[PDB]
Amino acid sequence: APNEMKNMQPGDVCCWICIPCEPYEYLADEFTCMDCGSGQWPTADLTGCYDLPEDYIRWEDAWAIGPVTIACLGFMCTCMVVTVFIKHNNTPLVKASGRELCYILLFGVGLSYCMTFFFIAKPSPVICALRRLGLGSSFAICYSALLTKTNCISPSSQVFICLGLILVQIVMVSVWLILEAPGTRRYTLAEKRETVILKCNVKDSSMLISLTYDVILVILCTVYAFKTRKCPENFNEAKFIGFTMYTTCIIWLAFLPIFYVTSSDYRVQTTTMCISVSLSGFVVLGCLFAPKVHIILFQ
Amino acid sequence: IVVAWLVVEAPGTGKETAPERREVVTLRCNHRDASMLGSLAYNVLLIALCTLYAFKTRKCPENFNEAKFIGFTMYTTCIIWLAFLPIFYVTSSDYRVQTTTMCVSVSLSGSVVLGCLFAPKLHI
Amino acid sequence: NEVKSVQPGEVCCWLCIPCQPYEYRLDEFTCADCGLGYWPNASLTGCFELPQEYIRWGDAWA
Numbered sequence: 001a002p003n004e005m006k007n008m009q010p011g012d013v014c015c016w017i018c019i020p021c022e023p024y025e026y027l028a029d030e031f032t033c034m035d036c037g038s039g040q041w042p043t044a045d046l047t048g049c050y051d052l053p054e055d056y057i058r059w060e061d062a063w064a065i066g067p068v069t070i071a072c073l074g075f076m077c078t079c080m081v082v083t084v085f086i087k088h089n090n091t092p093l094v095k096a097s098g099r100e101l102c103y104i105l106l107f108g109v110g111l112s113y114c115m116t117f118f119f120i121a122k123p124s125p126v127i128c129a130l131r132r133l134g135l136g137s138s139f140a141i142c143y144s145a146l147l148t149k150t151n152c153i154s155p156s157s158q159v160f161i162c163l164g165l166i167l168v169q170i171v172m173v174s175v176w177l178i179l180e181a182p183g184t185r186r187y188t189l190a191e192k193r194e195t196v197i198l199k200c201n202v203k204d205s206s207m208l209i210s211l212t213y214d215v216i217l218v219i220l221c222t223v224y225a226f227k228t229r230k231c232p233e234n235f236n237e238a239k240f241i242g243f244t245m246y247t248t249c250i251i252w253l254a255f256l257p258i259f260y261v262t263s264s265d266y267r268v269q270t271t272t273m274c275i276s277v278s279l280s281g282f283v284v285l286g287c288l289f290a291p292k293v294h295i296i297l298f299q
Numbered sequence: 300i301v302v303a304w305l306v307v308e309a310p311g312t313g314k315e316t317a318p319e320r321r322e323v324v325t326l327r328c329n330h331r332d333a334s335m336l337g338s339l340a341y342n343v344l345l346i347a348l349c350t351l352y353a354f355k356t357r358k359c360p361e362n363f364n365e366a367k368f369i370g371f372t373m374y375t376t377c378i379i380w381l382a383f384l385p386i387f388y389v390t391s392s393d394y395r396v397q398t399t400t401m402c403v404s405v406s407l408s409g410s411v412v413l414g415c416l417f418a419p420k421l422h423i
Numbered sequence: 424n425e426v427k428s429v430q431p432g433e434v435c436c437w438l439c440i441p442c443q444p445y446e447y448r449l450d451e452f453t454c455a456d457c458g459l460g461y462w463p464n465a466s467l468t469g470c471f472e473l474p475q476e477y478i479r480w481g482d483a484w485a
């Protein structure tokens with residue numbers, strides 16, 4: 001049979017012995033077994049490799065069921081928080097200290113909630129560029145708002161300095177994107193030629209350094225919160241911001257080694273990113289607004 | 300409960316083989332790592348009860364109040380284990396990595412428990 | 424080593440080909456597999472293996 005099984009002649013043309021070659025190698029000639037391009041599987045007739053469709057994307061399945069449910073739960077939670085803030089907190093002086101800052105922080109948290117939807121979607125150069133820019137933008141918004149909260153413990157100047165701290169990170173992200181936005185290419189895995197994974201080939205290490213620049217920002221915010229937690233701002237929120245800072249420090253220090261270890265598996269890439277973003281959003285929203293809504297409902 | 304799980308099974312340590320790796324052979328326990336899911340659930344319920352009771356000792360004097368030092372510990376342990384689980388799933392190298400990961404996780408959990416509970420008391 | 428010689432067409436010469444590396448029991452005309460957990464690399468005609476999971480007091484990871 002010619003089913004990926006070639007024949008050698010021992011000492012005469014009339015006599016040949018048939019031996020199967022590698023299953024991923026096709027018959028260029030009757031007496032030759034040769035490999036073909038990566039991501040292509042040999043055809044049944046063993047005449048030419050056909051390109052395997054890129055169906056290994058992170059499609060909606062049991063693995064994807066968790067992130068979307070967590071995303072919609074977070075969307076409901078942040079919508080409830082926003083409507084409580086805009087309903088029974090605009091006129092009272094409770095929310096007057098950081099109204100606009102809390103609103104823009106909530107917007108950043110909502111964009112971070114959309115970030116798991118950006119991650120789960122199929123890779124494409126435009127969506128890859130948008131995801132890469134947002135991954136810095138949303139967290140920069142959130143932690144610039146947190147840092148301005150720490151510095152508060154004048155509003156126009158604080159808003160302007162927060163906008164400047166956002167814009168410098170935006171410019172850095174823009175230059176990183178003009179470096180290599182698309183990044184889209186095929187991925188080849190050794191000893192796993194049967195499966196071809198379609199994903200954005202932007203460096204996971206480069207995304208790691210972008211996240212660690214934002215982590216240096218996180219650490220600056222956390223040390224500022226630890227320094228300023230001693231004297232409350234008459235509303236007992238400096239300690240709450242400090243606790244949020246330490247919990248986010250814990251989350252990131254967990255997230256960095258696990259990502260470094262599991263850089264191999266693309267499914268775990270898609271899952272851990274979403275899990276960490278959702279956990280950070282949940283914990284910040286809780287630790288910074290649950291006592292607020294509690295005292296609002298008590299009053 | 301763990302003895303009831305232990306009595307049914309038995310120590311069956313022996314060599315194991317892999318179809319994709321025949322040049323190297325390793326031996327380990329005959330019980331899967333998922334066998335202690337019942338113990339994990341029991342510990343999760345214990346942690347939940349501890350958090351619930353800590354939510355009730357809130358209005359207590361500073362000496363008797365620890366609702367800002369044991370609530371962190373439960374969350375820290377949960378983060379530790381929810382980060383150890385994906386590493387265990389992805390590594391799958393029975394020779395070294397699981398032993399090191401479990402030992403590091405247990406040691407760091409003990410360290411964070413000590414630091415959150417008694418280190419403030421030692422400082423005083 | 425790792426090559427088995429077979430001469431079906433004639434006795435004058437043989438077209439030796441390398442078979443699977445995990446089968447080295449005979450290695451005179453055909454290569455045969457060995458038992459599970461036994462690498463056939465002892466004295467070029469036998470199977471041997473070494474114990475693992477003995478990294479106690481190991482500098483690499485312990």
Ligand SMILES: CCCCCCCCCCCCCCCC(=O)OC[C@H](COP(=O)(O)OCCN)OC(=O)CCCCCCCCCCCCCCC
Pocket residue numbers: 239240243247279282283286287350351353354357366367370371373374377378381
């Ligand atoms: C979804 C992921 C996480 C979501 C939210 C996480 C909750 C906070 C994270 C860290 C805990 C510190 C509490 C903030 C301190 C504060 O500000 O106050 C602390 C308040 C009350 O103390 P007090 O009023 O006397 O003030 C103290 C002044 N220093 O809490 C409590 O003790 C109430 C009892 C605990 C109830 C929730 C604790 C949750 C821990 C485990 C939950 C499982 C999550 C699983 C995640 C994988």
Ligand SMILES: CC(C)CCC[C@@H](C)[C@H]1CC[C@H]2[C@@H]3CC=C4C[C@@H](O)CC[C@]4(C)[C@H]3CC[C@]12C
Pocket residue numbers: 062063066381
């Ligand atoms: C005690 C509560 C708060 C823990 C919540 C944990 C949530 C956020 C996460 C942590 C680990 C996650 C699991 C990790 C891996 C898998 C296997 C996959 O095939 C289906 C989803 C599933 C089963 C995930 C479901 C969601 C999950 C359980």
Ligand SMILES: CC(C)CCC[C@@H](C)[C@H]1CC[C@H]2[C@@H]3CC=C4C[C@@H](O)CC[C@]4(C)[C@H]3CC[C@]12C
Pocket residue numbers: 253254257258261379382383386396399400401403404407
């Ligand atoms: C408290 C948090 C950080 C705990 C997170 C889980 C634990 C188990 C993590 C923290 C750092 C991790 C290590 C970081 C780096 C490496 C090197 C790599 O070549 C093998 C895995 C190994 C050795 C990791 C094993 C798992 C590990 C020990």
Ligand SMILES: CC(C)CCC[C@@H](C)[C@H]1CC[C@H]2[C@@H]3CC=C4C[C@@H](O)CC[C@]4(C)[C@H]3CC[C@]12C
Pocket residue numbers: 286287290291294
């Ligand atoms: C496990 C998943 C679903 C997350 C749930 C987190 C919930 C249970 C946590 C997160 C933050 C927590 C709040 C943090 C701080 C305070 C202020 C304190 O004076 C009374 C309790 C109160 C108001 C906590 C109630 C419980 C709380 C809202």
Ligand SMILES: CCCCn1ccc(N2CCC(c3ccccc3)CC2)c(Cl)c1=O
Pocket residue numbers: 332333335336338339342343346376377380384387
């Ligand atoms: C939140 C409570 C923490 C205490 N804790 C933590 C883990 C724990 N394991 C049982 C199952 C675990 C595990 C199971 C399956 C895959 C990977 C890992 C590994 C070890 C116990 Cl038995 C415990 O008691």
